[PDB]
Amino acid sequence: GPANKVRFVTAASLFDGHDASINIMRRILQSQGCEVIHLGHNRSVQEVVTAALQEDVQGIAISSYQGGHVEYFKYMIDLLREHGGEHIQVFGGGGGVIVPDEIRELQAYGVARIYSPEDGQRMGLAGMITDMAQRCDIDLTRYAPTTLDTVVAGDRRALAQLITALENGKADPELVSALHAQAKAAAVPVLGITGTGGAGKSSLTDELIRRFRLDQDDALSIAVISIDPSRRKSGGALLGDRIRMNAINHPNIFMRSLATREAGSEISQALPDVIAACKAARFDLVIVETSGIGQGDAAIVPHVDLSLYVMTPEFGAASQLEKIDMLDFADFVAINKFDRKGAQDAWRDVAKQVQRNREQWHSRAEDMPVYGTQASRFNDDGVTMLYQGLVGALGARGMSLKPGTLPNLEGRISTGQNVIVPPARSRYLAELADTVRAYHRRVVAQSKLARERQQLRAAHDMLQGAGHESAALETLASERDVSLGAVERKLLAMWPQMQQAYSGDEYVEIRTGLISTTLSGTKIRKVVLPRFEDEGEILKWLMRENVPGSFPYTAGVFAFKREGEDPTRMFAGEGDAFRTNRRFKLVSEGMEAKRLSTAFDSVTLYGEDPHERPDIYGKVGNSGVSIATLEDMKVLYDGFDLTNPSTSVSMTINGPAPTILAMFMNTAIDQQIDRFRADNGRDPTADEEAKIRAWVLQNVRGTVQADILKEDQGQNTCIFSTEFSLKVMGDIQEYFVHHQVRNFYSVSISGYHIAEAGANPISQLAFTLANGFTYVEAYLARGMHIDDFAPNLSFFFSNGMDPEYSVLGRVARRIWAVTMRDKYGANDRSQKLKYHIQTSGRSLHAQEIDFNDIRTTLQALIAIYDNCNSLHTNAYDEAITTPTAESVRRALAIQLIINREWGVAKCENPNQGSFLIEELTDLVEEAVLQEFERIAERGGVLGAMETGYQRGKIQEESLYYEQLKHDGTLPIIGVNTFRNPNGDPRSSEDEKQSQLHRLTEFHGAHQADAEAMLARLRQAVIDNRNVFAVLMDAVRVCSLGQITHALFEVGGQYRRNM
Amino acid sequence: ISGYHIAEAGANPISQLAFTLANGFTYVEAYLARGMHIDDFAPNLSFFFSNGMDPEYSVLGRVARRIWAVTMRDKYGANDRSQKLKYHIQTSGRSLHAQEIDFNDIRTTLQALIAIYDNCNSLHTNAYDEAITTPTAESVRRALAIQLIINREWGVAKCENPNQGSFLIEELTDLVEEAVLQEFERIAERGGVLGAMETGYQRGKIQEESLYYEQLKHDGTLPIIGVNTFRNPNGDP
Amino acid sequence: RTGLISTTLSGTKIRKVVLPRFEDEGEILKWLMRENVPGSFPYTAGVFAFKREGEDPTRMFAGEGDAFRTNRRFKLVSE
Ligand SMILES: CCCC(=O)SCCNC(=O)CCNC(=O)[C@H](O)C(C)(C)COP(=O)(O)OP(=O)(O)OC[C@H]1O[C@@H](n2cnc3c(N)ncnc32)[C@H](O)[C@@H]1OP(=O)(O)O
Ligand SMILES: Nc1nc2c(ncn2[C@@H]2O[C@H](COP(=O)(O)OP(=O)(O)O)[C@@H](O)[C@H]2O)c(=O)[nH]1
């Protein structure tokens, strides 16, 4: 494509998980002939710049969708100019966030281009990329040094540019020979790491580097040369090795991503020169990673001092190892992903093969340099064992290094304990699908028997009343009585008594009104019973769709809808704790049913404290409330009695959820302690306070999202390793059990984010239920009684325009009810699936936003029809801006009008009976079960995730949606049809300074107890004790950021996967 | 034969449906007394009902169709073309309020939905600002988008009989139908529509039901979002 | 011929007219007499077999001023 070899560094801004099109802009650059060093999402300026300067790129592409873009790009321009990167051009995404004034401001500041959506429609998507790629079509070898003085001195920016000249072959021959002469005299070890594609080389390399740093106290200068294959046709390349490296962010670590620039070889054609360049730069160790090579490859061997073959337990038969050329030269062999099935057996086959290749029959196979590692696991002892081995090898390879600080332990095999879903239970989703289908087979069988029993006894009476009698009929009828189950027989027996119950004006100690009378005088019954005469139809209906509040709870989990509380629960989250608390009081104004829904800013969502640094500062307060300390949390819910039975608090938080939950619990407790110090005019005693805290935990109502699994399925907002988050999430659930927290739900299992990514209703429902069942299987494998954690499970679904949405809730309820009763044998409280429905954000369009209220009304209606437990209605202008004041009342009026004015809604089961509803229910349910089977044959949710099945399927359904939408096949009123002939088309500066002031004040107040508490927290993780229990005390003297980063030091950060 | 203006005067759905069908049958009896054949004028009969928020509106069309179909076949012995009652539904003008006129689009959507569910022959959707000023070109597009979105985007509407089977629908259908018949009997024992009109029975009954609506609306008993509850803090206009 | 099915984005086939799956011939006859399919006596579910697949004829209501101004608006809208 271009003239020179153009290299880019692409990333999403800090705390910004918006990677929807950063996967597509990388595709285009790779198909125009650019080498893109992709850094993924959630990147600080310091990270992107350090990457750009080392990779020595011509351009940088950043996509900022969370705001705070101005401060971010200004910082990047400043930091670039300061450290010799002023010739690097910075570009901005085509998002509709950066307004025209902010574009001209940044473009004048130093930013190359910031493409407006106006440029999107005009230039085209490929058009913008083409323009951007042509601007960066410059030669960088003219910035390269002509003498080795700067590079040898230690200047890394000179090293990075010297490499560019060598990679392009634009370096003077006399300079190259002097470089190799300097490298030979340097005498530094070069470690080669090769293996198949995706084996975990980059991940393991990162972990090994981490080991080096911790073991030698960052005293070692390590250079890293990673190589990824380049597309033959284009000439460009995808260099996705840096995106894995979490331990290279240090002045002593240097990394350069090289393209093969050959359609065959696995290493760079200029690898020997690039290595010699790093050796001469006085590095202590040089590490080289090759690309995905076949079995018969070993090109890395002559260029390095030591070689490490990385592989997975999946290599087929044992005889295949006799084909792997690299098993003949490898000084070390790492069988990574030792968490997978057959890892143990894989280790012995390889050990025996290496033993044969080396002809060391005088030794044990367990003494071979074959290790079993799990790089995905934080502080994996397996990786450390491999590290210990490598050091000893490099030690005699002429490398001075201090005695280790790491545990010099022994063994070859990883002793992984992170057991989530045991391989024996791998097919759990399939078993569940079998259980539901088994239930339906019984429904048919029993229904047929109930009919035959009735048909006989009826015909017998007709004969006996006509004179002649045939008692033979009774014999067959009595045979049906034994055939009919004890449960089914009781159902038909209670049916007449059931009709008498739902017939009167009251449902009779306690009484409940059954009838609401209209203006016309008509009596509308809350629950309408069928008038079937056939006992086959009665039994069939009673088993498949009973009345609300009876198994399988298809029509709802409760007998009747609650009077005091509507399902309404509206979002709120803006600026600091004070402004949001004002919005909370305004939404709950004049309502006994105080049900709050909290939204946190991107800073809090990633478990970070607000800071002066332009990366974070610009994001504090946007898109959500900034909560950093327990004091902020107290202000957030001041004036509300969290313990009050009519008050429930919802809050959307995932990664840092256990910390936020801990703050909420302390807030709820302190409310009652303050209530006691007021009502009694004295502080409660040691005994009194204990009784208070206990009562608070039991009665506190609310819900925290904390769906970690959904984060590694699209939204990418994960800050902890999935295994660690699941451990702590389990720690939470155990804490709830021990203190009888019966009214708080530990997890709102989301599918909204999934549906927002383009997933059709069936896939959304199927994945969410699957992810829900994964949690169940996880806690069961841990050792929890099903009745202990199942009632604490919440759900979160997205509605929409698709027909399947009308029966989403009822299907979710029945699948849950049946499986929880039959498969897991749980009580009635566990069989009841409670969920929240929020209307489709993907159905709200930017064109003709007034039409959105029509769509949100229809979605709210079926939600209420299908007896949802909680409903949030979107404002019409959410497609363009944030929910305003006038707009949030129109969104709230939708629920109010339906619940109060709409006549059909006076009935609480208007869906039941409908031939369409029941057929759709049957259809959708089966479709979900089949999806359960597809996930189960991939190894369950976790298994499918390692391939990216969910994310892959979602992305497929998204493109299908957008295709038909643009095609006009799928009509969208106001967008692709019925277009308007006339018209073609968030946080105070004080509030930010407030949060900083409050934070530094909080830190000062607990300056003494801070460290001792954080240390206690880390020790809890090391000793595998309950983490949440410590968090209940930690949030009192430690801030959000302090806690998160303490856990980082001991729990590890999420590695950017795919 | 229209019942929109009747409903507009405050008449509840049952009285509206009952009077309109009654007035329709009066025409039939009138033309029959002139000695005309039933199959000659019955297919030329069109109806016009008002929808609204009341539950009975969800089954107004289906009840009107069955009462017509059965009577035209059994009582008057007319052909299939005569047994088919066609009608036009316009949303409630009564349900459109002057306070918070943006909320009216919500109400008009719900009324348009049950109208289309119940297989109406013709539908007119009111603009949100018709409560106050004359409908703007923009306001009339929001009213037109309601029908467009339901007919095109709304998934349940892809099915043409989503009402059928529903235990609520069938019970309401049975209830409403009977209530209408009883009203037929009250008018008949007054001498038919013409006879009742002589005593101002219809006018009288409508005015009674209107005051009952106003009484409950003013009372707060009958909640109206934006009017007698959830009122706008910033100001009444 | 007339299409009975409209397929969704998910692939689900939504039938225009959904029939009951009753086994009791008492329920069948009862349903057939009280609420038959659309376009069959007593036409409870509608007088026509299926809804008109053609776009709904947007009525054009004009009437203000004298005969000339109304005639113009008629001609303009019905262009
Ligand atoms: C990307 C941006 C969008 C987002 O991410 S927003 C996501 C955040 N989360 C949300 O919006 C929704 C939060 N989730 C929740 O509130 C809950 O999980 C849930 C289940 C949906 C709703 O819970 P609640 O409304 O509080 O109701 P509840 O089940 O906790 O009630 C507790 C006890 O009250 C009683 N009750 C409530 N309704 C009743 C009825 N109709 N009949 C009889 N009894 C009833 C009942 O005793 C119940 O206790 P129990 O069930 O017997 O143990
Ligand atoms: N289940 C599991 N996955 C791992 C493990 N180690 C690495 N991975 C993942 O395997 C993928 C490929 O690893 P990668 O670092 O890219 O190796 P490379 O392609 O050879 O550079 C990444 O998504 C890693 O997160 C492990 O020990 N277990």
Ligand SMILES: [Mg+2]
């Ligand atoms: Mg890699």
Ligand SMILES: [Mg+2]
């Ligand atoms: Mg590589």
